[PDB]
Amino acid sequence: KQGKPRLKPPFPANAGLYGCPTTVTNVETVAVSPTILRRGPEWFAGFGRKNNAGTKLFCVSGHVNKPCTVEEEMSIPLKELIERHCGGVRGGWDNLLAVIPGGSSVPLLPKSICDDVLMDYDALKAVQSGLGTAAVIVMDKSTDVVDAIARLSYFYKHESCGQCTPCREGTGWLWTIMERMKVGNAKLEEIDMLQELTKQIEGHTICALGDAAAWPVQGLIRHFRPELERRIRENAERELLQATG
Amino acid sequence: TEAYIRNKPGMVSVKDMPVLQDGPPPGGFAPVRFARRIPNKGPSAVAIFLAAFGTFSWGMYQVGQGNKIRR
Ligand SMILES: Cc1cc2nc3c(=O)[nH]c(=O)nc-3n(C[C@H](O)[C@H](O)[C@H](O)COP(=O)(O)O)c2cc1C
Ligand code: SF4
Numbered sequence: 160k161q162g163k164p165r166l167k168p169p170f171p172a173n174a175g176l177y178g179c180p181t182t183v184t185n186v187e188t189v190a191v192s193p194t195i196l197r198r199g200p201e202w203f204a205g206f207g208r209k210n211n212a213g214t215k216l217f218c219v220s221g222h223v224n225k226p227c228t229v230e231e232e233m234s235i236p237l238k239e240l241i242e243r244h245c246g247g248v249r250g251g252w253d254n255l256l257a258v259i260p261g262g263s264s265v266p267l268l269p270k271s272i273c274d275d276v277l278m279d280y281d282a283l284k285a286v287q288s289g290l291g292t293a294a295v296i297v298m299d300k301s302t303d304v305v306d307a308i309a310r311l312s313y314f315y316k317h318e319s320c321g322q323c324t325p326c327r328e329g330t331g332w333l334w335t336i337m338e339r340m341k342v343g344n345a346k347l348e349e350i351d352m353l354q355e356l357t358k359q360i361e362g363h364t365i366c367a368l369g370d371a372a373a374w375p376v377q378g379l380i381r382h383f384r385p386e387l388e389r390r391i392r393e394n395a396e397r398e399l400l401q402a403t404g
Numbered sequence: 405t406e407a408y409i410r411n412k413p414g415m416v417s418v419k420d421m422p423v424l425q426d427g428p429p430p431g432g433f434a435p436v437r438f439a440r441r442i443p444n445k446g447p448s449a450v451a452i453f454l455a456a457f458g459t460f461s462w463g464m465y466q467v468g469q470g471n472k473i474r475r
Contacts, residue, residue, distance in 0.1 A: 399414045
């Protein structure tokens, strides 16, 4: 049938693929299973940290000199990873503006935070974000962060299939608001409305794509309010100056 | 559903948005009067009484002179 999700109370352990007991696992875990089961679980637990352990392969791409994908152990400082395996950012902690640790479904990490955050399931999970798929993205000081977030929200609009209403409607709306905020055609109460919409969608959808559509804009208006307010103020001033003629 | 309807032109926030122009001008227009005031400036007692009595006496004198002429 069409690619639409189900309701969870029949968890896919007693009513799954054909109604049979069927579980879904990512290719990561099921592909790592043989060697972890052969080389003993202690050799595995001897990595990462106490509650987060194992070797995960990150795919670092975006605004680095050498876009790469390499496997490291969890709880690795972002500085260490980027500066060691991948190429150093065009300016090492100089023109690096934003970092998205997880996939596109994870709130941002500004420059001041990510200098000394560990890379595991808990450290940045405690900061605000989530490791998710561990696809770290970096964005220099010469890239409109609000434009990147708007493009991500457009993607989420173009992917939410639309079974239940919150995700569908709210995602179209979020893309529209993010475009208007990219150009600068809004007010401040509009960014508070953005936060409110984010909260509603995140709360009340079927499964995690609602949270996916809500998280990036939430992190944006959490860690990047001043520049957004500056864009709004400059557009308002330019509009007034033009209207005076 | 209120921002541009109320006022679109140039505000930066929802406050200081509209222009209303509803009530009174600055000053309350006036202090007004509400208490009655009826001035009593007519000739009060002795003026009117002397007028009546004097005109009566003089009219009687005139009637006398006239009846003299008519006789
Ligand atoms: C919006 C959305 C996107 C997802 N994308 C992926 C994906 O790219 N790969 C994947 O294996 N699972 C994806 N999932 C499913 C979850 O990651 C699911 O927990 C996972 O397949 C099973 O977890 P595990 O195998 O790590 O235990 C997605 C789920 C949602 C709601
Ligand atoms: S965004 Fe949510 S409610 Fe919509 S199709 Fe995806 S899981 Fe379903």
